[PDB]
Write a protein that binds this ligand. Structure first.
Ligand code: MG
Ligand code: MG
Ligand code: MG
Ligand code: MG
Ligand code: MG
Ligand code: MG
Ligand code: MG
Ligand code: MG
Ligand code: MG
Ligand code: MG
Ligand code: MG
Ligand code: MG
Ligand code: MG
Ligand code: MG
Ligand code: MG
Ligand code: MG
Ligand code: MG
Ligand code: MG
Ligand code: MG
Ligand code: MG
Ligand code: MG
Ligand code: MG
Ligand code: MG
Ligand code: MG
Ligand code: MG
Ligand code: MG
Ligand code: MG
Ligand code: MG
Ligand code: MG
Ligand code: MG
Ligand code: MG
Ligand code: MG
Lengths: 167, 197, 127, 61, 106
RNA sequence: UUGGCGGAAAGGCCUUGGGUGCUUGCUGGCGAAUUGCAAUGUCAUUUUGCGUGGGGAUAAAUCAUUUGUAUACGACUUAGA
RNA sequence: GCCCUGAAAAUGGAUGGCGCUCAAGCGUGUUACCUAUACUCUACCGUCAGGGUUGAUAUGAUGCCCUGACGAGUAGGCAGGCGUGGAGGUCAGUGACGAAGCCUAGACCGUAAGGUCGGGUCGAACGGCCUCUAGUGCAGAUCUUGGUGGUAGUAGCAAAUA
RNA sequence: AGAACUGGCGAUGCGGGAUGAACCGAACGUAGAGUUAAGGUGCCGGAAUACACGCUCAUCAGACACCACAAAAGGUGUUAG
RNA sequence: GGAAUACUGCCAGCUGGGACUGAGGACUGCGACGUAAGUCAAGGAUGCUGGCAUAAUGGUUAUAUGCCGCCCGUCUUGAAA
RNA sequence: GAAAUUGUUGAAAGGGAAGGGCAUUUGAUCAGACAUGGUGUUUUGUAU
């Protein structure tokens, strides 16, 4: 032979893991995030946009909407660590929000063969967006300048110190 | 906060200004210093002249052209004081030094720009009242700088033009103040005052 | 395809080259310990080369393991190949350097039949 | 640093696992290390340590 | 508007060091606006990106990013310690860097 | 586009007239989604090359020869349609 | 007390440097802050120590496993390994379909001595393991023999009339 | 130059004393995090151009143990007794 | 005369932010909450989600930058000499 | 048909040596994992 042999071979049976003791308690959200609060989106496609927060989803995400008629942000879910909760709050009693959940926003995962060499929206999704924002701008029109505030984007100006700024 | 910061060197103590400027240049700020002939050094004029003659006697004995070079202009005196505070033999120090320009007077690139001061290097805020101090233009002239009078004449012409500019600016400012005083006491102005503006 | 293992950690992946083996051609880079009385490397002055020591030893669970997770076993023929029949998740065969091409093709065919991973299945191949 | 009051990494100085490579003697020390581990009788430990010994420490009786 | 900045600018000052030995695994960041450790405590855990340009396009861009985060405060003057996935290249002593507002506690 | 002013490194500052675009000063209508819960998510300016099409202008220097106000050699200083 | 006089040496120069004057000096007090291979906690390597485990199946009881502590080093001791020429045994080992050798900012293993592979070149033998044996490992000895540089297209190739 | 006791260097890296066998701190497997020693925090250089009470102006100031020196005697300089 | 407050100390008082680590691998132990079934933060990390699936991470190598690094061997108390 | 030493070609760097250590940028270059058993047969070579 070229190499002689090993006297003992390791066994190939994989051992089972020990019983872990990590239960899943629910997420405790920070106190500023109550439904109906205006959030500033910090990252994403809609970064710097002001949206209204509706429902805390099951997978620790926040259901938000623009409303879509106001600034073009649809019914979406965002990560709670990537938003700034302002003190501006609109009443969200009168929305039908328990339709939306985790399996509502499914992606239909793409196969490996479908390679985009070069390069649509659900009708139920656009009608749900219409139903939600029709109730939302009814409350938005009460306080003055709120629609324009929600339409405008947020940015930091020269001299703005986020550790001193109030939201 | 600015791309370029322009420092009026008048009334500034040389070493304290040089330490502030060296730290700024190493941190990445572009600095230009104007009016280096009006920089101050603490201590009497005779003391600083003796110090310069002490610096001036040091030279390479076998060949004076490779020795320590004694630069006579006030801008170069400030540059010497600042290069001592920068690690100038490294690439980092060379880059930090090329982010810097020092001038006598205020040349026409910078005569229309805003000049700031550094209060932790200002003489009237740092020296005890009564302590004697030296003016760098006088010291440079005593040791061999040849251009004190031409800089003074150019500064006089610049100051005349700058006063003509400032009179117009002040008149326009009083018109603007009159306009927004008349446009105060309105509903918009009261709302702004409620909001803090 | 290999057995599950922890993440392989190499404590010191850099080669321990002998002092001044860059300075002189006659000094080969094979490691020797400096025995000199004044040697900065033996005395461990700051800024000098590190020396091999027992603290750099590999974790025993991941020692001798290739990045694929196997241990390399040199094989010269199909009879040496078949000693890894029941150990395909722990060992990978490497055909010896002096095996002819026409014996390499036989060894490769048998290894594909037996499911044994071969580390160098391109040696002496004709295309 | 530690102010060591004793030598570090010192061997016990007692011969275990006898220097002989007599296979029957190794079988005997295997049997008696089993007995000395699991019978709690001092005789087994004494004869195990005696089995380890060198020739000049085993004079004939 | 004419501004779109959602980060706070900072400068990369130096590595963590003693007088004559530097530790490249830790960088020191001067965030603008902050002057005390108490104000610097707001930015602990925030993400930091160093953004630079290259001649070669790699995966659809000529812009490359080094990611890291703020770990603790440094000194009495609001400088922070930051650690990056790969250490910063030391020619960026004096280069700008971006401190984002996420992960947010507001 | 009109008239100025600026030489410290001016190369910038001010002004007249008309054209054209925008205007969030105020009130409306439509759009935005799917980048899927973040990924700088690419918007800057520096140099150069190669093409179009539209202007513009048509040289010298060196070697070799020559001089001796120069000269170790180079270099210098002269001359030659 | 501080300052000043007393206070003179040879290249140009040193509170480390710049420079600093209600100090960036001197005396004293209070905090905050910086960072050593030290201290604390954790991982991994090794060493030492104390223990567990012959039961069946499958192997290695010098095996596997549990627990604690420890790690500086010339001269020097000891131990476990790596490599070379040759010898007994074995792998019915490799090889003209290419052995050995050599080259290779190509790959992999080992803390390391080293080991392995791919590619090029090449042409006739060589290796793994268990043991035996030695004329067995080089950077130095103004070492030995051989080969080759920089110096360097340099010193120079100018006595005896042409 | 020669003794005593102890601790060291030789045989020893590391942080500090710019620099240095012996001083100060601390003794060393390979790494991570935290806290410190001695020494420091204007800038070189990581870290308060911190806070507080005074003293000092030198036409050779002074600036930190080992340590890289200064004395007798003087001064209506100024300060407190 | 009646308090308050400072300072110092104690709590097996409550609570927010940040960082580094996730060794082990069936069960066995000590506990806690429950009448019970059982559950648990109690002898070492799991759950949910995304992008990529390639030179992107990574390795090697040349270079750049920050800080550090004197020539080996030898005799010697002491070697870069 | 090794090395010292040398030519050519290519690449790279170079303000009074060069070489080295830790760390990353940049350029170049490169290994590894990508199937897995699987409900299943939307099936051809009818059991692939
Ligand atoms: Mg060599
Ligand atoms: Mg020695
Ligand atoms: Mg004196
Ligand atoms: Mg100091
Ligand atoms: Mg003090
Ligand atoms: Mg540390
Ligand atoms: Mg034991
Ligand atoms: Mg220890
Ligand atoms: Mg022989
Ligand atoms: Mg061959
Ligand atoms: Mg080579
Ligand atoms: Mg032949
Ligand atoms: Mg011999
Ligand atoms: Mg030799
Ligand atoms: Mg030797
Ligand atoms: Mg010789
Ligand atoms: Mg000649
Ligand atoms: Mg001659
Ligand atoms: Mg000795
Ligand atoms: Mg010592
Ligand atoms: Mg600093
Ligand atoms: Mg007195
Ligand atoms: Mg208290
Ligand atoms: Mg790469
Ligand atoms: Mg990489
Ligand atoms: Mg690289
Ligand atoms: Mg290199
Ligand atoms: Mg370097
Ligand atoms: Mg150095
Ligand atoms: Mg002597
Ligand atoms: Mg031949
Ligand atoms: Mg060669």
């Amino acid at each position: 032979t070229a190499q002689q042999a090993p006297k003992w071979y390791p066994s190939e049976d994989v051992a089972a893991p020990k019983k872990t003791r990590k239960a899943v308690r629910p997420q405790k959200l920070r106190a500023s995030l109550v439904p109906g609060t205006v959030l500033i989106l910090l990252a994403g496609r809609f970064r710097g946009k002001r949206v209204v927060y509706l429902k805390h989803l099951e997978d620790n995400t926040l259901l938000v909407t623009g409303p879509f008629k106001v600034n073009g942000v649809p019914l979406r879910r965002v990560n709670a660590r990537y938003v700034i909760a302002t003190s501006t709050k609109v009443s969200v009693e009168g929305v039908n929000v328990e339709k939306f959940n985790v399996e509502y926003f499914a992606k239909e995962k793409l196969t490996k063969k479908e390679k985009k060499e070069a390069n649509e929206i659900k009708t139920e999704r656009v009608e749900d967006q219409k139903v939600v924002d029709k109730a939302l701008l009814a409350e938005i029109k009460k306080t003055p300048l709120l629609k324009q505030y929600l339409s405008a984007s947020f940015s930091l100006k020269n001299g703005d110190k986020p550790h001193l700024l109030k939201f | 906060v600015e791309p370029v910061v322009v420092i009026d060197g008048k009334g500034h103590l040389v070493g304290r200004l040089a330490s502030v400027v060296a730290k700024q240049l190493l941190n990445g700020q572009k600095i230009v210093v104007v009016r280096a002939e009006e920089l101050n050094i603490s201590g009497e004029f005779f003391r600083n002249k003796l110090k310069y003659h002490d610096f001036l006697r040091k030279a390479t004995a076998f060949n004076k052209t490779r020795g320590p070079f004694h630069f006579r202009a006030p801008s170069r005196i400030f540059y010497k004081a600042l290069r001592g505070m920068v690690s100038h033999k490294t690439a980092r120090g060379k880059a930090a030094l090329e982010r810097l320009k020092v001038f006598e007077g205020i040349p026409p690139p910078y005569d229309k720009k805003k000049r700031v001061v550094v209060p932790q290097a200002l003489r009237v805020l740092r020296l005890k009242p009564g302590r004697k101090y030296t003016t760098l233009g006088k010291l440079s002239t005593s040791v061999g700088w040849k251009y004190e009078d031409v800089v003074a004449k150019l500064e006089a012409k610049r100051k005349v033009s700058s006063a003509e500019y400032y009179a117009k600016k002040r008149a326009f400012t009083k018109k603007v103040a009159s306009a927004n005083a008349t446009a105060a006491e309105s509903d918009v102005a009261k709302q702004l005052a409620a909001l803090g503006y | 395809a290999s057995l599950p293992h922890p993440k392989i950690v190499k404590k010191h992946t850099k080669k321990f080259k002998r002092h001044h083996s860059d300075r002189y051609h006659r000094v080969a880079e094979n490691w020797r310990k400096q025995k000199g009385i004044d040697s900065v490397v033996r005395r461990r002055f700051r800024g000098n080369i590190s020396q091999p020591k027992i603290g750099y030893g590999s974790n025993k669970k991941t020692k001798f393991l290739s990045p694929s997770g196997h241990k390399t076993f040199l094989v010269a023929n199909v009879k040496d190949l078949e000693t890894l029949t029941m150990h395909t998740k722990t060992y990978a065969a490497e055909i010896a350097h002096n095996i002819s091409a026409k014996n390499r093709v036989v060894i490769l065919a048998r290894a594909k039949a037996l499911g044994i991973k071969v580390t160098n299945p391109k040696g002496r191949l004709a295309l | 640093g530690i102010d060591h009051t004793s030598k570090q990494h010192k061997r016990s100085g007692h011969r275990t696992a006898p220097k002989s490579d007599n296979v029957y003697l190794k079988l005997l020390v295997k049997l008696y290390t089993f007995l000395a581990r699991r019978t709690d009788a001092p005789f087994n430990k004494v004869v195990l340590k005696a089995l380890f010994l060198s020739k000049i420490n085993r004079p004939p009786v | 508007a004419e501004s779109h900045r959602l980060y706070v600018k900072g400068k990369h000052l130096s590595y963590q060091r003693s007088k004559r030995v530097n530790n490249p695994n830790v960088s020191l960041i001067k965030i603008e606006g902050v002057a005390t450790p108490q104000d610097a405590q707001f930015y602990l855990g925030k993400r930091i990106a160093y953004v630079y340009r290259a001649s070669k396009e790699v995966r659809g861009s000529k812009i490359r990013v080094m990611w890291g985060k703020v770990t603790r405060t440094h000194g009495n003057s609001g400088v922070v310690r930051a650690t990056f996935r790969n250490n910063l290249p030391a020619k960026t002593f004096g280069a700008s860097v971006r401190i984002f507002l996420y992960p947010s506690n507001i």
